[PDB]
Write a protein that binds this DNA or RNA. Structure first.
Ligand code: K
Ligand code: K
Ligand code: K
Ligand code: K
Ligand code: K
Ligand code: MG
Ligand code: MG
Ligand code: MG
Ligand code: MG
Ligand code: MG
Ligand code: MG
Ligand code: MG
Length: 88
RNA sequence: GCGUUAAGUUGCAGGGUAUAGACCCGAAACCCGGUGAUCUAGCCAUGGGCAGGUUGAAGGUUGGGUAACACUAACUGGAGGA
């Protein structure tokens, strides 16, 4: 759902440089962007169960990445959820 | 068979009959034209009344909760031919 420009913008804002697409912060920010963007799709299409399975995978993938970041560097974790607006 | 050989008629009094309320009193009812919604039934307009004490619906806020909902606890709130 995310376009190329929007994706590239996130990589630059959370990565080390322009092609640090793999860092945990970038991945979590990318997932957060798609999850938030898809809230408008599922408000209109409540019965799109097949797409929602893909969304719930993003949610669980983000939870696992966050639990890993919190276990490695708590400081990086705290900054990340604050910038993104996540409860935990 | 009915008649012919038996005086009627007009007053007055009386007996009966007829039409009339027709010896007197008495229905329940039927019809016609009026008077009544100051009681009461319903409605319409415009005003008033309901001591005191209870119960605690929806909603709201805050926290928990969720990807977001849902959900949940407290506080608040003051529903009802209660
Ligand atoms: K005579
Ligand atoms: K008589
Ligand atoms: K009362
Ligand atoms: K309540
Ligand atoms: K009450
Ligand atoms: Mg993907
Ligand atoms: Mg006479
Ligand atoms: Mg008659
Ligand atoms: Mg009759
Ligand atoms: Mg009258
Ligand atoms: Mg009256
Ligand atoms: Mg009552």
């Amino acid at each position: 759902s995310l376009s190329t420009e929007a994706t590239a913008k996130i990589v630059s804002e959370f990565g080390r440089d322009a092609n640090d697409t793999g860092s945990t912060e970038v991945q979590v920010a990318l997932l957060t962007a798609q999850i938030n963007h898809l809230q408008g799709h599922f408000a209109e299409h409540k019965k799109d169960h097949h797409s929602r399975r893909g969304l719930l995978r993003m949610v669980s993938q983000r939870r696992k990445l966050l639990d890993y970041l919190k276990r490695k560097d708590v400081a990086r974790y705290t900054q990340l959820i604050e910038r993104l607006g996540l409860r935990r």
